[PDB]
Write a protein that binds this ligand. Structure first.
Ligand SMILES: NC(=O)c1ccc[n+]([C@@H]2O[C@H](COP(=O)([O-])OP(=O)(O)OC[C@H]3O[C@@H](n4cnc5c(N)ncnc54)[C@H](OP(=O)(O)O)[C@@H]3O)[C@@H](O)[C@H]2O)c1
Ligand SMILES: NC(=O)[C@@H]1C[C@]2(NC(=O)NC2=O)c2cc(F)ccc2O1
Length: 320
């Protein structure tokens, strides 16, 4: 396929570039999936909360499997367990719904989307009349053991974590019979995650960078905050290498051996996003991109300012 891979501790090879699907709407996502698969993507990043798994499933049924264009075994599919589904009794039903929507037998990777839980039910964002969330106190260690039962059932090959801090990861590892294979977190030159990455490396977790292009797609942008794709150093390197700024951002990550899942529905961008394995940055150029680190996080749960979940005791970002 188009991308090089990293070996997870499970023995699975995970492509260093995957297709992100948040905000890829029903009515466009089937085309994005089909285009990406045809040009050599072998890694898709999904989530129940994105509201598009049913359509992704139609794309997969037509394109992936026996007698189809892509063998199932060559495809890496990630999905994620949503916050309202942390209770042990809800974990299997949640995965089974995802598998039915995606029209798959099994997932290659299943992540706990966030370390904290929302009230059980069929409202993905259960809330009060003030707009604040109704939380649930199910601990992630309890959810983890429920997730482990899914591996024993042959429904998921590997488990992982999304938006966990180093302390929370260590906490999961203290009870894990099945070790998490992957940590998925926001990561790009403004939020380099150097220490967290080193932490994962020590414990055998590979890291996937979400929002690796700075999620210019996002609906709550501070006009005052810098745009990653517009960073002068990035644009300078883009000119030098005859590449797009997005390719610079992506190259930086895959050169660090960090998995990236850029989202696009634009065929030309989908193609360029995976073409990041034919050039290399010098040690000085890597240092220049490394210097951009500024502890600037773009992806934070917000309400009607203001951080929505930032006051929760199990909020992952409050640690350094
Ligand atoms: N685990 C989590 O809590 C979590 C959180 C956030 C994201 N994610 C995952 O990570 C994925 C990526 O993050 P993201 O979607 O927030 O943002 P992103 O991939 O950093 O950026 C997406 C935006 O960049 C544009 N784009 C894509 N390729 C481009 C290119 N080559 N040149 C210029 N613009 C380009 C896209 O526009 P077009 O589509 O119109 O081309 C879209 O507006 C998500 O889709 C999701 O799968 C996970
Ligand atoms: N702002 C945030 O931190 C998160 C991000 C997030 N996108 C994502 O891929 N995982 C997320 O949880 C998201 C996705 C949704 F479908 C709705 C809201 C939402 O908010």
């Amino acid at each position: 396929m188009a991308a090089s891979c990293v070996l997870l501790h499970t023995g699975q090879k995970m492509p260093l570039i995957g297709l992100g699907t948040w905000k890829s709407e029903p009515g466009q996502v089937k085309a994005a999936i089909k285009y990406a698969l045809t040009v050599g993507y072998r890694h898709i990043d999904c989530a129940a909360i994105y509201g598009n798994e049913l359509e992704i499933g139609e794309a997969l049924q037509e394109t992936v499997g026996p007698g189809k264009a892509v063998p199932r075994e060559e495809l890496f599919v990630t999905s994620k367990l949503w916050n309202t589904k942390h209770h042990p009794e809800d974990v299997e039903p949640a995965l089974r719904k995802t598998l039915a929507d995606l029209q798959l037998e099994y997932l290659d990777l299943y992540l706990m989307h966030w370390p904290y839980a929302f009230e059980r039910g069929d409202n993905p964002f259960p809330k009060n009349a003030d707009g604040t969330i109704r939380y649930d106190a199910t601990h992630y260690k309890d959810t983890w053991k429920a997730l482990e039962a899914l591996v024993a059932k042959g429904l998921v090959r590997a488990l992982g974590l999304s938006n966990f801090s180093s302390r929370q990861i260590d906490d999961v590892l203290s009870v894990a019979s099945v070790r998490p294979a992957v940590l998925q977190v926001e990561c790009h030159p403004y939020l380099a995650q150097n220490e967290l990455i080193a932490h994962c490396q020590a414990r055998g977790l590979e890291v996937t960078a979400y929002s690796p292009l700075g999620s210019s797609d996002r609906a709550w942008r501070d006009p005052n905050e810098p745009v990653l794709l517009e960073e002068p150093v990035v644009q300078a390197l883009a000119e030098k290498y005859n590449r797009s700024p997005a390719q610079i951002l992506l190259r930086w990550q895959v050169q660090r051996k960090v998995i990236c899942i850029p989202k696009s529905v634009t065929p030309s961008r989908i193609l360029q996003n995976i073409q990041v394995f034919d050039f290399t940055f010098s040690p000085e150029e890597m240092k220049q991109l490394d210097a951009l680190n500024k502890n600037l996080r773009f992806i934070v749960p917000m309400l009607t300012r203001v951080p929505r979940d930032a006051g929760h005791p199990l909020y992952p970002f409050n640690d350094p």
